[PDB]
Symmetry: D2
């Protein structure tokens, strides 16, 4: 279990006039996937994130290979690519679950942990709890 | 006067774009890329809509953004777009995000790769970038 | 079972600087709830909705009684208020599921079924399949 | 010259706002109410932000919209807002949506009820509408 899975049934609001899913939604799903991971494996991070901790997204990207239709069942699999003192690089595989599974997109995010008054924040070491939650996903043993 | 120009999209940050942290949720930066590129189309090649309603599709092959600072509600944003690369059937767009103030602060940089296609939704074949679009992007084409 | 239930865990993107859920999201959940109802009870409507059928929202409204926080578990219960020849009035109860359940909002939508070229559409009788799917929700027997 | 005026928010419809049907997804109309009301604040009472960051909260008690026509991508929209009612602690805003063309077509009408509050997030007490805000809305106050 080296990845976290977020499942989603595509809705009409996510489509555009061409009939497929508008590209922005793929980036939105990265955030949804990453926060559900926190909800299920490190809920304590919200209290921090509701306090003074901040998760700053340094980079967000997605490459698209195929299209998605309304009501396609999607599985976004998140993996930990790299964990540094203060940052985390996350990888996302987007699978359309059907008669057969199809990789419709692949993305990445780099996030930095930070604390301090808005405008006067500084990078902080990845919270111990989050590092523990990442245990099964870390390449390092 | 023939120096490559950028197409500028200006936006005043609202509250819907902010999260509990107090700054702009990252997704909005990618949204603004689409908004910027479509307002460019609206102003320079509105006739592309008729094509987009028929069989023409602008398929985004890649979208990315790197973030350097924070944006707060009511901040004045300027998204500057340039055509950085044009092949037979694809276009690469560059986006520079600036917070307008005394000193314009670069808050992020983005990029998109788009492929032109025509065909039965699901049975699409690549097509050469529409002539009208190529001409429209001409003045905003970056050489470097 | 006179209502359909859509469950959702509130995420960070749905909050604003004040820490609660931005009001627009409540209206978005009505659409999400109504389409998941279709997905589970009248999936054939998509094929129609991907063809020439159109669900035109004539009215959408929501009244707010309390606030919602990130990661609160929400239950949106949808009921059929009225079913006419061509229209449907839907009611939505928004419950925050916690130690105790709290009614945080209540909304309504009126939708009209229509067919025809965009700009030249006309109201059509509610599709037989949808009427059947509404059987357990109809006041009429 | 003293006739009640409306505050106008103009928006060019984009592709993100459209659904597979080809018109604007209904949710966007409610979005535009917030956008319109906040741009009003930005232009007429920007200092409210400092209050919104501290303890002031604009709680939306009710939001509604009725739809009469369709809006397509690239349509020019005008959302006109008026203060329709002002009590000690609440405000009711009216929104008229028009598609701008030769003949401006009314495509929808909306309304919002907002309550002013201050206090520990969850332990909020109602407060009288801020003086600065009341004055800012003055010229856009509707009597009927
Ligand atoms: C180091 O010098 C700075 C200017 C580098 O900033 C960019 C180029 C690289 O940022 C790295 C990836 C992350 O650095 C911190 C964690 C980000 O700080 C963001 C904050 C809002 N300034
Ligand atoms: C009947 O006369 C029309 C003008 C009334 O339109 C509004 C006031 C009432 O609309 C009712 C509730 C629904 O009528 C149809 C179903 C809506 O048509 C929408 C279409 C895009 N014009």
């Amino acid at each position: 279990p080296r990845y976290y899975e977020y499942r989603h049934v595509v809705g009409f609001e996510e489509t555009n006039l061409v009939g497929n899913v508008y590209y922005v939604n793929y980036l939105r799903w990265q955030g949804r996937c990453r926060e559900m991971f926190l909800y299920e494996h490190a809920p304590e991070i919200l209290d921090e994130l509701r306090a003074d901790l901040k998760l700053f997204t340094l980079k967000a990207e997605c490459e698209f290979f195929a299209e998605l239709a309304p009501f396609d069942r999607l599985a976004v699999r998140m993996r930990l690519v790299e964990l540094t003192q203060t940052q985390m690089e996350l990888g996302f595989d987007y699978l359309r679950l059907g008669g057969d599974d199809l990789l419709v997109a692949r993305g990445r995010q780099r996030i930095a942990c930070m604390r301090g008054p808005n405008g006067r924040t500084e990078p902080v070491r990845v919270p111990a709890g989050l590092v523990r939650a990442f245990a099964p996903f870390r390449s390092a043993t």
